[PDB]
RNA sequence: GAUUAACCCAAGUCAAUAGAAGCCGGCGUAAAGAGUGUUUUAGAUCACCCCCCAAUAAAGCUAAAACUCACCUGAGUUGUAAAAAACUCAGUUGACACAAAAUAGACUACGAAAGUGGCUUUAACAUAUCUGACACAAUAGCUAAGACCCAAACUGGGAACCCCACUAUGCUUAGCCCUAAACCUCAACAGUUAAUCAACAAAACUGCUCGCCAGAACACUACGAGCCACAGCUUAAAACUCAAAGGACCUGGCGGUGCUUCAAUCCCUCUAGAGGAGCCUGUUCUGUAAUCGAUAAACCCCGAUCAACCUCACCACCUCUUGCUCAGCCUAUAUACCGCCAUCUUCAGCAAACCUGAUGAAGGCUACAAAGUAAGCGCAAGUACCCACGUAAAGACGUUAGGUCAAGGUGUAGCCCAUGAGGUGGCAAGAAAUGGGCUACAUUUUCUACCCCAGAAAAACGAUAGCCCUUAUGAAACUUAAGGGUCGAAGGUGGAUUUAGCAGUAAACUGAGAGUAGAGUGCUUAGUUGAACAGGGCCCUGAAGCGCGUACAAAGUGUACUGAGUGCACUUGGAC
């Protein structure tokens, strides 16, 4: 039985989102990539550094926005910029949201030597795609 | 097992005697069925009566149908005769071993 | 098979297509009309419409093939045919007028008659009741057995350094004349069937 | 008849096998009941219906007519130009066919279409083939030549060729090796 | 009666849900649970056509009278 | 057992004993309707309206079939699975019972019950217009005398059960014994169908009377008594023990369960192989100071897309102590887990939530449809590749405490001058077996040219092994790989047996990629040439249906002989 990146069935009381509800094999068919950069393309380089940056950024954001991110974080690498798009709950105060956004922007930018932007889309709650 | 062999012999004789007459049924009697042998399952769960088949396919099918329909009546007749105090269900199985010999001799001729 | 079940095997026979409509029966007319709608598989590379096509010889070639060297298989087959013809020509030239009539010279006729002579009427299968029992053979099995027996006999190591064409030609002539180890093998099979006659009721 | 899924989509409803059988049997009875046009029109709403393209005959600078066609087998591709009139010459890659194909099997493949239509020696052919092995090249050239000859042989002849299989592109292609098994179907020697 | 000469399950279900049931009960039917039984013949085509016509006329008359009375009320 | 906390009662608490709790309930299957019938004293209101079949005893009789005896023939007869044992006896015909009573009987009558089914005759089948202890009581058994065809406990012989012969006994008379699953397991009489009811059984009840039961076992027993006339029946306990016993139903499990369907697909069938020789390689045992895990399918070129140091977790030695880490630990615990997978799965089912059994465990099917609907998951469908095909991919719930704590994280356990950290050196071998792979044994071959129109080799074929040398990598080459020479070995198609494949498939051949400094005959992948069978069956495997019988979460009653069976009758509380 495949235990990899799947949500096992339960009594039906377990809500799950689009990503959690889609399994790996559907990738590139029903769900796209959570990180969009040119490292892995044919003839390019720095795939390992792109992967390290992705992992570090994801952990950074998860720890920065505890119980606030309502969906996985979409990373885009246009030119040298970085765009982190997040779906966040409308549970934390807007002032705190803006401060965290600016702080993370500046710190990540200085850390990785490239402009960074964070774009938050707020929702009343995590978007249920089905119940399991 | 010697007991099983004796049971097979007695059942073969009894079934031949039964089929010798219209006792089971006039329809069955008219078919003139000939029994090749009788074999009892090792656990005594069934009694297979191997009957010789004829060349005609429709005749074979009709004989099989009649035999299947009359198996229970034959079992009852045996248990009533007391040839055996207990008789398992009777199953009629087609026998076709002699076809090889027949067609051999045809070709060899 | 990449061919879907809808695909039908192609029919390669000019006469079947040239037959007049009038001679066709209603069933044949319906079959011809139906085939216009079905899917036909692409023809195998083996068979064509040549008037010199022999399916029996093609099958013997395929059986004699090892590992996909169809070229060598065909070479051996044609060489055997030529050798048989050469031997028959020599015999005809060395034979008087009366014997010349009885002497055959067609390699294909000799080939097919020898295979027919080597076909086994009956073959023994294990029957369960296991007992080796004389049992009739289907025609396909008889032909296949004849071909395999001829090939095996020609592949026997008893022939030292002799080439496959010469060996096969000699064995083919022996079978054609109802002699040789292949005929002996058929007779042995028949004798075993006769001896196991008693066990046929199984 | 339209399949059960077709009928389900038509009725935007979820049916059963027995429901489909009932509907189809009623429709069949409607056929058998001397359905006129006013009824056959309705019935055809549930019916489902179940030829090689003749390429144009182009002309050269000298005005000689010809027909160009193409065909692919395995990994081979072949472009064949067949002339309306010719002495049976068949030049492959600028090379004579017998020289280019040193195998009588490939020669027979080349001969198959023209032999089938009994037009040997009536057409001069120029075939440019590329890619694949010898047998694949032979098959591609045969297909291209058959298609090109279609334009010059009558429609009944074209239909006969198509029935034979000359004009049907071969779908048999090598099946990719699968991970964990030596071949497309060869499972590794079963250990114990 | 269903096709196996048993009370139609709909009768019991309607009794459960408290939906009144008019019903043409034959001499072999079971009128215990039918709110408004109409002892009669359910097999004669003439009888069934009479029942259908009667009910159709009753429903049509009821609806037309409803519309007429509604119009009378609204006009004033 | 101790500790903490708590609960009840409280000048009491609660261990033992005893008592208070005691008959309008039942009797087909649980204890209970006594084997049957009839009284008295009584009781009740149901009292008023109201032929014959098979009963029983006696006498007489016999159609068929037996035995025995007569002839006439024949030499074997009998016996069964098959033989033995036994008789010389066997067949026809004829005579011929004190035995039993086809067919009718598919009838359901008579009798209180037990029982009664050949024919005739005689005698004869109680009663009030209610219930209610001396007379009967099947088969078995005993006494005395007869009959003895046949059957048959027991005995003997033959190979308990089977066959042979034979005795009590079954039969008549005259007396005894009084027991049966003596059962329609349903007491007599009267009445009713009004509202059904533990379950099954023979629909449910009312009135009325008599008999019977008060958990199981002890116990159809002991003591006493009656009948006996001494080996038995009837009546029938107590003590001790236990919290059960028992009845009717529902479901799951199990077979060493047969018949019928089945299955690159269980066996055969087609092809190609493994095992026989060498080599590469993994594993186990030995060895080693010296590697962990993997371990039947589902380990065995597996973790490893790979070990000269490193890798490395091992051994030996040496060295360090807040240690790269707000230490660490490749040390135990996969039988705590996450993470990732295997197996069926080469399956299709898993399913929440809803909606008959008079609301019990439980059940939910019929298409000319009769209580099932089912979201969702999975197959499917969809998608990649070249189709609409196939292969990929997917493959739910559960199965083996399956593996993996040494990918990493982590519960838990333990070490912290060492179970942590660092440096130098090292085996990585073979009595022996075995798994997989490569190379062969050749003539469809060897060899060159070529990439398919030729010439040589041909007992030579045949090592990627061994030995020497050199080259590539690298600090380091006996360590790895490559090139040359050398040697030309085993072997001549292979045992137990056995693997894979249904078509561009097998088979053969040739390239490329992963990983490293280098390193595989390993792995991955591309392409070329490219076939044969495809039809039979089920012993073997497994999957089903038909189903059978096991069981856990033929049977019996009475009676008697023998030593558990048998004999006779009876019941279904079994099957057809
Ligand atoms: Mg009616
Ligand atoms: Mg009385
Ligand atoms: Mg009494
Ligand atoms: Mg008595
Ligand atoms: Mg006696």
- The Cα–Cα gap between C11 and C44 comes to 11
CA-nearest residue to D107 within chain C is C45
Residue E75, classified by CB atoms within 10 Å of its CB into exposed (0-12), middle (13-18) or buried (19+), is: exposed
Cα A59 to Cα A126: distance, rounded to the nearest angstrom: 19
CA C46, C1' F531: Å apart?
11
Distance, CA of D88 to CA of D67 (rounded, Å): 15
Burial degree of C110 (CB within 10 A; 0-12, 13-18, 19+):
buried
Which phi and psi (to 5°) does residue C21 adopt?
-65, -40
Chain B interface includes C12 (CB < 8 A): no
The DSSP H or E segment spanning A83 is strand A82-89
- The pair of structure tokens assigned to A34 is 């959570």
Query: How far is it, in rounded angstroms, from Cα D183 to Cα E52?
Result: 73
Q: Sort out which chain C residues have CB atoms less than 8 A from B108's CB and list them.
A: 121-122, 190, 193-194
Pairwise CA distance, residues B14 & B20, whole Å: 10
CA–centroid distance, A58 to ligand 4, in Å, is 104
CB atoms closer than 10 angstroms to residue C163: 13
Do B100 and C200 count as a contact with CB atoms less than 8 A apart? yes
Q: What CA–CA distance (Å, rounded) separates E60 from A19? A: 58
The secondary structure element, H or E, covering residue A123 is: strand A116-123
List of E strands, chain E:
22-23, 36-37
Distances (CA, A) of C10 to C57, D162, D165: 20, 10, 7
| Residue of D164, D93, D153, D169 whose CA lies nearest to D120 | D153
Interface test with C, best of D104, D105, D163, D172 (most C CBs within 10 A): D163
Distance from B81 to chain C by nearest Cα, in Å? 31
Q: Which stretches does DSSP call E strand in chain D? A: 58-59, 65-73, 76-83, 90-92, 95-96, 125-130
- Pairwise CA distance, residues D72 & C144, whole Å: 37
User: What residues in D contact C45, CB-CB < 8 Å?
Assistant: 105, 109, 135
In the structure encoding, which two tokens stand for residue D149, read together? Answer: 């000859």
Residues of C in contact with D168 (CB under 8 A): 40, 42
Residue A50's H or E segment, with its range, is helix A47-64
Which resolution in angstroms does this entry have? 3.2
DSSP one-letter code for E76:
-
Token pair in block for residue A33: 């990539």
Give me the residues paired with residue B95 across strands: B52
DSSP readout, C42-73? PPPSS--S-TT--HHHHHHHHHH--TT-HHHH
Centre of ligand 2 to C-alpha E39, Å, is 56
Using the structure block, give the residue that is written with the tokens 């079940």.
C5
Q: Roughly how many angstroms between the first and final C-alpha of chain D, as a whole number?
A: 52
Interface test with C, best of B34, B93, B100, B101 (most C CBs within 10 A): B100
User: How far is CA B71 from each of CA B30, B65, D190, rounded to the nearest angstrom?
Assistant: 16, 10, 49
Beta-bridged to residue A84, according to DSSP, are A75, A118
**D38 CA to centre of ligand 1 in angstroms:** 39
Closest among A74, E60, C175 to E68, alpha carbons compared: E60
Angle at CA A97, nearest 5°, toward A93 and A103? 145
Neighbours of C, requiring at least 3 CB pairs below 8 Å, are B, D
- Nearest Cα of chain D lies from the Cα of C71 at a distance, in angstroms, of 9
Q: Work out whether strand D95-96 and strand D125-130 pair parallel, antiparallel, or are unpaired.
A: unpaired
Q: What distance in Å separates the CA atoms of residue A132 and residue A11, rounded to the nearest whole number?
A: 7
Cα D95 to its chain centre, rounded Å, is 27
- Chain D CB within 8 Å of residue C40 CB: yes
Q: Tell me phi and psi for residue B95, to 5 degrees.
A: -120, 130
Cα D144 to Cα C22, D52, D69, D109, D138: the distances in Å are 36, 13, 6, 12, 10
Among candidate residues D161, D152, D156, D129, the one with its CA nearest the CA of residue D65: D152
Alpha helical stretches, state H, D45-96: none
What is the spatial distance between Cα D4 and Cα D2, in angstroms, rounded to a whole number?
7
Residue in chain C nearest B101 by alpha carbon: C200
Directed axis angle between helix C107-118 and helix C181-195, to 10°? 20
Distance CA C44, CA D109 (A): 10
| Polymer length of chain E | 76
Residue nearest to nucleotide F554 (CA to C1'): B86
Q: The tokens of C193 are what?
A: 């069937």
Radius of gyration of chain C (CA): 22
Rounded distance in angstroms from the CA atom of residue C198 to the C1' atom of nucleotide F126: 83
Rounded-to-integer distance, Cα A16 and Cα D125, Å: 66
Contacts of D148 (CB under 8 A, 6+ apart): D55, D67, D68, D69, D80, D81, D82, D125
Please name the residue of chain B whose CA is at the shortest distance from the CA of residue C196.
B101
Nucleotides of F under 7 A from a protein CB: 80-82, 255-260, 268, 271-272, 296-301, 339-344, 352, 367-371, 374-377, 382-399, 435-437, 443-445, 451-453, 458, 493, 499-508, 523-534, 537-539, 547-549, 554, 574-576
C34 touches chain B (CB under 8 A): no
Spatial CA neighbour of D71 closest among D176, D165, D175: D165
Nearest CA distance, C14 vs chain D (angstrom): 9
Whole-angstrom distance, CA of residue C3 vs CA of residue C7: 6
Give contacts of B 78-107 with C, CB under 8 A.
97-98, 100-101, 103-104, 107
Got the DSSP string for B39-107? Answer: EE-TTSS-EEEEEE--S-HHHHHHHHHHHHHHHHHHHHHHHHHTSSSS---EEEEEE-THHHHHHHHHH
Dist. CA D112–CA D97, nearest whole Å? 14
Task: Spell out the residues 6+ positions from residue C20 whose beta carbon is closer than 8 angstroms to its own.
Answer: none
Query: What is the H or E stretch that residue A97 is in?
Result: helix A94-112
Burial bucket for residue A84 (CB in 10 Å: 0-12, 13-18, 19+): buried
Contact of C37 with chain D, judged by CB distance below 8 Å, is answered with: yes
Q: Phi and psi at residue B12, in whole multiples of 5°?
A: -60, -50
């Amino acid at each position: 039985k495949n235990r990899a990146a799947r949500v096992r069935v339960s009594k039906g009381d377990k809500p799950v989102t689009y990503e959690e509800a889609h399994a790996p094999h559907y990738i590139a068919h029903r769900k796209g990539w959570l990180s969009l950069h040119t490292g892995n393309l044919d003839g390019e380089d720095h795939a390992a550094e792109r992967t390290v940056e992705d992992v570090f950024l994801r952990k950074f954001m998860w720890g920065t926005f505890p119980g606030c991110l309502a969906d996985q974080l979409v990373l885009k690498r246009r030119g040298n910029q970085l765009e982190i798009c997040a779906v966040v709950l409308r549970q934390l105060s807007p002032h705190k949201y803006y401060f965290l956004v600016g702080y993370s922007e500046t710190l990540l930018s200085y850390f990785y030597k490239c402009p960074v932007r964070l774009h938050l889309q707020t929702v009343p709650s995590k978007v249920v795609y089905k119940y399991l | 097992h010697a007991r099983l062999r004796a049971l097979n012999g007695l059942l073969y004789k009894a079934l031949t005697d039964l089929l010798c007459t219209p006792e089971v049924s006039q329809e069955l009697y008219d078919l003139n069925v000939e029994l090749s042998k009788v074999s009892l399952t090792p656990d005594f769960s069934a009694c297979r009566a191997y009957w010789k088949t004829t060349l005609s396919a429709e005749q074979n099918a009709h004989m099989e149908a009649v035999l299947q329909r009359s198996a229970a009546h034959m079992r009852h007749l045996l248990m009533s005769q007391q040839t055996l105090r207990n008789v398992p269900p009777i199953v009629f199985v087609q026998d076709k071993g002699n076809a090889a010999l027949a067609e051999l001799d045809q070709l060899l001729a | 098979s990449r061919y879907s079940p809808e695909f039908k095997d192609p029919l390669i026979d000019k006469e079947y297509y040239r037959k007049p409509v009038e001679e066709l029966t209603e069933e044949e007319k319906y079959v011809r009309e139906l085939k216009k709608t079905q899917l036909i598989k692409a023809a195998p590379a083996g068979k064509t419409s040549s008037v010199f096509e022999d399916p029996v010889i093609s099958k013997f070639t395929n059986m004699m093939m090892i590992g996909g060297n169809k070229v060598l298989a065909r070479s051996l087959m044609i060489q055997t045919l030529e050798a048989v013809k050469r031997k028959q020509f020599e015999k005809y030239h060395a034979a008087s007028a009366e014997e010349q009539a009885t002497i055959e010279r067609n390699p294909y006729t000799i080939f097919h008659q020898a295979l027919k002579n080597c076909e086994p009427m009956i073959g023994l299968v294990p029957i369960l009741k296991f007992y080796q029992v004389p049992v009739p053979l289907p025609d396909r099995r008889r032909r296949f057995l004849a071909m395999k027996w001829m090939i095996t006999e020609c592949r026997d190591k008893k022939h030292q350094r002799t080439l496959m064409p010469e060996k096969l030609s000699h064995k083919l002539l022996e079978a054609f004349h109802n002699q040789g180890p292949v005929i002996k093998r058929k007779h042995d099979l028949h004798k075993m069937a006769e001896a196991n006659r008693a066990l046929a009721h199984y | 008849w339209l399949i059960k899924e077709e009928l389900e989509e038509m009725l935007v409803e979820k049916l059963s096998d027995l429901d489909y059988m009932q509907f189809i049997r009623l429709l069949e009875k409607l056929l058998t009941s001397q359905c006129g046009a006013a009824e056959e029109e309705f019935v055809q709403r549930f019916r489902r219906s179940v030829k090689q393209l003749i390429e144009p005959v182009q002309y050269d600078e000298q005005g000689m007519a010809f027909s160009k066609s193409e065909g692919k087998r395995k990994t081979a591709k072949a472009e064949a130009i067949v002339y309306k009139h010719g002495s049976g010459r068949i030049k492959v890659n600028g090379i004579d066919y017998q020289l280019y194909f040193p195998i009588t099997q490939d020669r027979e493949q080349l001969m198959f279409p023209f032999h089938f239509v009994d037009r040997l020696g009536k057409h001069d052919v120029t075939c440019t083939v590329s890619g694949g092995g010898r047998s694949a090249q032979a098959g591609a050239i045969r297909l291209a030549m058959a298609k090109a000859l279609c334009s010059f042989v009558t429609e009944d002849e074209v239909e006969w060729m198509r029935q034979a299989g000359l004009l049907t592109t071969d779908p048999r292609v090598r099946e990719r090796k699968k991970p964990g098994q030596e071949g497309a179907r060869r499972k590794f020697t079963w250990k114990k | 009666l269903n096709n196996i000469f048993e009370p139609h399950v709909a009768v019991r279900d309607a009794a459960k849900m408290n939906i009144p049931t008019v019903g043409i009960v034959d001499t072999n039917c079971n009128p215990c649970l039918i709110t408004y039984p109409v002892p009669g013949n359910d097999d004669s085509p003439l009888a069934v056509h009479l029942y259908c016509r009667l009910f159709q006329t009753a429903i049509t008359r009821a609806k037309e009278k409803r519309q007429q009375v509604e119009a009378l009320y609204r006009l004033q």
